């Protein structure tokens, strides 16, 4: 009955094993913790400015929100032991009221997201092309807050779904907040913002039954796509492995729209923003990603948090595609068309700076959930263009943030606050934090000598002025004829893919269309694919039991994009960029592990910054051949192959795990998913479960012992991400 | 010199770069020192009195925003170049959707308003401090009452009840008097009214009573008035309302200032000491400035001439250094004495007569600083009687019981969520730590690994604190509860006429006349005559003299049966209690009062010098009035600045009128000057006439020999000013009442 | 009520010009879209519902004066929502959790809501502990992990320190925590309530829902993998059974 | 939106049109209207593209803005004619 | 009283249902990072049923103390050992 009474006092273990070490530790070594407790020495101007709202807990009394000390937090106030609860229990009512009101509306789109703190630093001054203060000095450090997201799913949906990913960066500049709100693909599905609710309604769960969550694999999405060919380009990206990234650290970022850079002389240069991952480009395979939404719906959120806790800081290079004003009409596509990409072969990405994400938040709700990004948040030195999708976004973000964040003072929520000064004549509104002392709440005023005052535009610390673009035309609701091309960009993307990426696009479309109940929708989508590429259209049609007509086989292919048939920068894997730091290997233990193998495996993995998870049939410990006590991180079922990048089976008492269904399935799944597998000594007997002949094959590392050559072979395979050459062999594998 | 021309006459007013617009002489800036009302423009508290400070005011510095020498920016910190124009395609073209500066500015403006308070929507607030006279550790373990040297910052909001946030101050209504104590052991809110009782007994009836008093639902009329059918319909059918109605119909319902009214918690609460002993308590606020009220005609007309009179007077008194001061008082009743009275201690429609249980002086509260921003500090302030601290507890009073639920519930929608305690004005100054998370507008960033208890992950922190003599956890007094679950009023509450009778007989004859006139005026506004008759029938159960006088004014004749109604009994042997009268016991202070001085084009400087010297010595303010603004020149050449016109600052706004000598012919035939005196005369205010100004006695129908309340002499001097200040100490000239009815004003 | 001529384009100054603030059609369409979401339920945010009817077998006037239970021919329309507890509105169906079973009875004498779960008991004894228990089971505050799972430190920390939770924990750990369908689980009001008859006599009562389809549950590996292959499995099965005429029935 | 608690303020009885109103807008706080349309987007084939756009015409036609000619640079500037 | 109702439930289950309860606890506790929490939960299970606690402990590499093996089972519920 002591559990139902005040107080329980000290409940922590005497050994202090409840507390995680405040130092970089590998994933699973320590319990995860709020950022300021895990890495207190990791700081920047924004993190430091948040100290005034940080609340501790240690050695403090439990109180009401009014500061009244609570004596009993286990019971309601009642008339007797077994009596009715009394209306006068203000402690119960305050505690329950706050609980009852915890939830706020989720984001209309990108509701599912994971965020981190970091910093940006430019390589050199960009004063020749932009007067933006954050890009003016190589020694200028700009704090950032980045949120990565899916699009369709709710805040409680799964991470490894097939979707476009959001990549939003809040720059806390000395001249205002700049939000770069992008996606992991260089194009969007639609051309004009007016269609945004139509497209979103089509991709989102269907209105009658609210199915499916985090999936475009349903009738309404494909109905919209079939009737709106402008969507075909982004659909091609979503159907590719781009739609299933391995991690937020292994995907690209793009602003999509052409914006303008404005220099001190007033010269405008067209710009498209890019984020290039230091970890390279890497994606999952469909079966692995779908099953991973089951085994770990928080996979990406977890991987992001744990990489930062390990010191494997996600790093991205900021890049600009720069086009002079006089080159506006030099391309086959309209620069203002967000369904069109600018090929890197035509306009190269100029590396401008680097962003490092080095600290997790303290409280997910207060920092991540309440963060408000808006592409309308630009600074002097930047400007918009007439892109009709960007134009509409400018209205949307401010409007949605009012209801989501409960009013017009959302900029006063700590995460959203600028670190630079902010002063104006705006007043009141729900939850007003700032107390204005200004005698005047209007301008022009004489009572406060007209302060705060306007600042003229200038080279630095000047007021914002829009680029004086010449506008000529009649007031029309009309799409520009220049935007009326829908097939060349999807064709360019398709031909830029490797044959194995092309197979994955075919399988992506085939799987999704098989989930469409109305067959005519499938047929209409296949007809659209025939206007892109006949090989793609035939391969999808075959998987759907659809036969193409003679007329469909005679469809003239769309033209090249300014002479380009393909661009290898559009492929995830064509150009190698694979880094092993931060990757994870499963190590399948047995009851009498050969310690020499394990010592060599771990030493080689550590040298490359590759993590390991020791797996067994149960938790606790196992004892090696030399007496070394090995702690078990998880079971074979607990941390499936889906969650790792490679599998290593060291030697020892193999008979212990040879007939274990879970051990054999672990290898079969990793095999099917094209993951590198390494087998030492008697572990080579597992080749039988994966149908591999005695002579072996590429992608299966094997030797008498785990040593120098063995580990170099496995790490080289890990640098290539997956064993693509294994694809013809997986179809026979029951996994 | 005084011919300042505008810096803007052309298209430059539509362009950026208007730059410095303040006058070169710096006359735009008010002096950051105590100044009398109207001497300087009013200003935010931190700019007017920067040296006036307390723990709460100091803790608000982190959210205070400046302005001087700063760039005009968006809420994102982006410097604005042009705040005069929208972005358009050409100078005569359409506004562009891409104008984010316009949209942010208009969005914030479009969302400025929040719901007003359901009741007490009209209010005025100030910062201050409380300090107890001595330790009260024998009766309460409350930290704020434990040491005479312990200073507790306060935030007080005074209010009306019925009217909206934009309604008038000098209405006939009950007034709210809410005090937020920022104690070291939590926030304690003492949420009271200016009368010792409420209209109703059980909280379940609160929406019925409020809906009846509020504007009628079909047409939303009347504002700030109980003078309508529904209110009197409810009163006529609910005799429990009669006691507070008597207070509302008296001059208590029309206070002169928030500084000149009493405050009461109404409910019996409990004080809990370190030994666990409970003592029943009723809270009182005793005004240092004494008790003073307006008269009906004066109050009603003042809602027109200055709907902001009380808000204004409160703000200016603090700016002048005439700080509102109130003594905290306790009526203490031992637990064993619970059933010793004719009335139920838990009945909020019953007062505890001071003759039976005296008010014990406990401490003093001083309001010494105005807020910086009315919306941020006053509008967003959230008071709740449920906000008690260890050393205090509730009782079973059925009105208090329901209040405990209401305040938290209303504050969620009014203040946009459960984090309203994070709004700067509402924040405790003492530590606050718990496992509550999220909610709209969450400011606090919790670093605790645990958001639950019991927990081992944070070694169970924050932790429960056992109850104790000081710094202990809150524990409810272990009151014995015995009875069946019932929706039933206690028979003990079923007495409605003795307390209204006690109040009535405690009033002076002139206060009694004002109660009769209050009821008569209000009931004359009721359209359905049967309602008037039913109310008169209720008055006959209180006092026959009262009922007959009201009935006469309404053309109603009392029946033989009504004339034979047995009067209600005394209250524990008391027929009356002089503490219930505003004026029976003198307590009139002159400091902070205002005198209108009616100037002429050639004022006798000797009179004006003597008048101003004597007023200043007593801390009485003066306003120099004339037929126009600017200046007038005295007989000796002294240049006199005019504060307002006769029409601009009417007699309603002042406590007394002085007319010095000089060129009286200049103002003798001025309608406004004569009406000024006629109005002040009708409203029973002291009037002083020097030399040729005595010719004004003809407009007020006063004989050559004069009368009490009219100060007159050959010149304004020592005796003249002492006579006027003695009249001002008595507040009004009650003896003048029989003469005012013939006055056309 | 204004007829729209073109729902494909924003209003702009020229075919490649800026969007104009005067496009009231665009702004209304985007404003509504921008404000579609409302807060999800604090608990039981993931749920699936259907319309139906209730009918008593005989008059229960001897034990209760409740009008909906007074006549065997009295048909009471119902709205039922089945749910999980921990997960968001976008979380998966076949998680290991307790299930909600809420019934709204549209009676002739007012709405009666029978708000129950698929287990006969709850985790805790006093409502004061509800935010403590919920915060412990929900995603951890620093990183908002895990979704739809009690398989994390804070939940088991609370359970280890609060033995009153053990009973409902046993039920959650059993196959009761992974039902095959909402049609194949029991329902309970958990609390003892009172029935009051016309003579004023009180009888203590505990409410039960007995599935006509019987009791059936998944196995853990299947339930977990099914949160991946079909996170909408229960919502789908409920909708489709109704569309097929295989009406969920409960006594 | 803030004064009336959401985007469905047109469903408040006084604000309701007396003429028909049908579109693809959904949800929002206090949604009164229960949409039966299988589609909540356009173009759609699942509901044969209904509700449909109406071309502008003499009566009962769709709204079209007057094709005013716009010529000028993007400026934050008062017209001298207003001075 | 916290153990007699969990025991009644446990004893009312089929051996395959009991195996599934053991596996439920084992899988969940394997996901708990702090080992002392797993041990404290196993200690609670020992106050319910020793067969249940031992089976969960084995899957977690936890060894029950002599004191834990000597924990007296909670009483039956009004004479019932099981309710099918
Ligand atoms: C280039 C095409 C687009 C991109 C790259 C994009 C990207 C994003 C991203 C990354 C977020 C989430 C930011 C966060 O982490 O909180 C988001 C939020 C959102 N976007 Fe966009 N978006 C696009 C187009 C649109 C359009 C056309 C509209 C509407 C006209 C729109 C309306 C919204 C809204 C309402 C939100 C939720 C904002 C909030 O609640 O704070 N987006 N978008
Ligand atoms: C002794 C009888 C009563 C007294 C002295 C009293 C006094 C007051 C005062 C002074 C205020 C305004 C606080 C401020 O300045 O912000 C107020 C507000 C209010 N009162 Fe009472 N009240 C009484 C009874 C009730 C009852 C019975 C209820 C309902 C159960 C109630 C509900 C409210 C509500 C809902 C507000 C608005 C508070 C807010 O919006 O922050 N009051 N009361
Ligand atoms: C016998 C124990 C309990 C049972 C069976 C139970 C059951 C449920 C169910 C089924 C719902 C979802 C109704 C729906 O489909 O919308 C729910 C909602 C909820 N429950 Fe309970 N509950 C219990 C205890 C609690 C406690 C102790 C509290 C708080 C003190 C609580 C607070 C809530 C809240 C706030 C909601 C959301 C209601 C809404 O947003 O409409 N529940 N509960």
Curated annotation (Swiss-Prot), chain C:
The active site is at 44, 117. Induction: By entry into stationary phase. It is found in: Cytoplasm. Decomposes hydrogen peroxide into water and oxygen; serves to protect cells from the toxic effects of hydrogen peroxide. Belongs to the catalase family. HPII subfamily. Homotetramer. This is Catalase HPII. It comes from Escherichia coli (strain K12). The gene is katE.
């Amino acid at each position: 009955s002591s559990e139902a009474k005040p107080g329980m006092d000290s409940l922590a273990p005497e050994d202090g094993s409840h507390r995680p070490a405040a130092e970089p530790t590998p994933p699973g070594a320590q319990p995860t913790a709020p950022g300021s407790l895990k890495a207190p020495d990791t700081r920047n101007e924004k993190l430091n400015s948040l100290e005034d709202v940080r609340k501790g807990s240690e050695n403090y009394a439990l109180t009401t929100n009014q500061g009244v000390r609570i004596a009993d937090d286990q019971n309601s106030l009642r008339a007797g032991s077994r009596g009715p609860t009394l209306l006068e229990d203000f402690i119960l009512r305050e505690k329950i009221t706050h609980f009852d009101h915890e939830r706020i509306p989720e984001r209309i789109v990108h509701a599912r997201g994971s965020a981190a703190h970091g910093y940006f630093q430019p390589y050199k001054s960009l004063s020749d092309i932009t007067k933006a203060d954050f890009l003016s000095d190589p020694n200028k450090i700009t704090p950032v807050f980045v949120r990565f997201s899916t699009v369709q799913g709710g805040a409680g949906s799964a991470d490894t779904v097939r979707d476009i990913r959001g990549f939003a960066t809040k720059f806390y500049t000395e001249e205002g907040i700049f939000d770069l709100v992008g996606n992991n693909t260089p194009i969007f599905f639609i051309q004009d913002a007016h269609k945004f609710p139509d497209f979103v309604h089509a991709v989102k769960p269907e209105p009658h039954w609210a199915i499916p969550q985090g999936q475009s694999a349903h009738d309404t999405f494909w109905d919209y796509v079939s009737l709106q060919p402008e969507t075909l380009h982004n659909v091609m990206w979503a159907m590719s492995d781009r739609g299933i990234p391995r991690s937020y650290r292994t995907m690209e970022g793009f602003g999509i729209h052409t914006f303008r850079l404005i220099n001190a002389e007033g010269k405008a240069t067209f710009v498209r923003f890019h984020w290039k991952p230091l970890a390279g480009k890497a994606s999952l395979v469909w079966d692995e990603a779908q099953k991973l939404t089951g085994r770990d719906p928080d996979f990406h959120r977890r991987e992001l948090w744990e990489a930062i806790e390990a010191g494997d800081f996600p790093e991205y290079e900021l890049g600009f595609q720069l086009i002079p004003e006089e080159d506006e009409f030099k391309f086959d596509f309209d620069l203002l068309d967000p369904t069109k990409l600018i090929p890197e072969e035509l306009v190269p990405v100029q590396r401008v700076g680097k962003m490092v994400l080095n600290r997790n938040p303290d409280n997910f709700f207060a920092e991540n959930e309440q963060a408000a990004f808006h592409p309308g948040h630009i600074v002097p030195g930047l400007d918009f263009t007439n892109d009709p999708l960007l134009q509409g976004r400018l209205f949307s973000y401010t409007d949605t943030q009012i209801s989501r964040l409960g009013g017009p003072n959302f900029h006063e929520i700590p995460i959203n606050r600028p670190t630079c000064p902010y002063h104006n004549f705006q007043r009141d509104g729900m939850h007003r934090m700032g107390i204005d002392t200004n005698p005047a709440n209007y301008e022009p005023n004489s009572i406060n000598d007209n302060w705060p005052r306007e600042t003229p535009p200038g080279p630095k610390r000047g007021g914002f002025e829009s680029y004086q673009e010449r506008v000529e035309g009649n007031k029309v609701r009309e799409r520009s004829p220049s935007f009326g091309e829908y097939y060349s960009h999807p064709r360019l993307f398709w031909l830029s893919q490797t044959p194995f990426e092309q197979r994955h696009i075919v399988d992506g479309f085939s799987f999704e269309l098989s989930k469409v109940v109305r067959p005519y929708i499938r047929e209409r989508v296949v007809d659209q694919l025939a206007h892109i590429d006949l090989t793609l259209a035939q391969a999808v049609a075959k998987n759907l039991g659809i036969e193409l007509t003679d007329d469909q086989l005679n469809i003239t292919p769309p033209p090249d994009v300014n002479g380009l048939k393909k661009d290898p920068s559009l492929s995830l894997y064509a150009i190698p960029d694979g880094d092993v730091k931060g990757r994870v290997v499963a190590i399948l233990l047995n009851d009498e592990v050969r310690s020499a193998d394990l010592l060599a495996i771990l030493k080689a993995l550590k040298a490359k910054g590759v993590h390991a998870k020791l797996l067994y049939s149960r938790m606790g410990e196992v004892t090696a051949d030399d007496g070394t006590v090995l702690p078990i991180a998880a079971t074979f079922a607990g941390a499936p192959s889906l969650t790792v990048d490679a599998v290593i089976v060291p030697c020892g008492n193999i008979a212990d795990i040879a007939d274990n269904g879970d051990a054999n399935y672990y290898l079969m799944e990793a095999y099917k998913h094209l993951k590198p597998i390494a087998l030492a000594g008697d572990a080579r007997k597992f080749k039988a479960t994966i149908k591999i002949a005695d002579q072996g094959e590429e992608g299966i590392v094997e030797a008498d012992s785990a040593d120098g050559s063995f580990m170099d072979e496995l790490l080289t395979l890990m640098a290539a991400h997956r064993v693509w050459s294994r694809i013809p062999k997986i179809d026979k594998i029951p996994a």
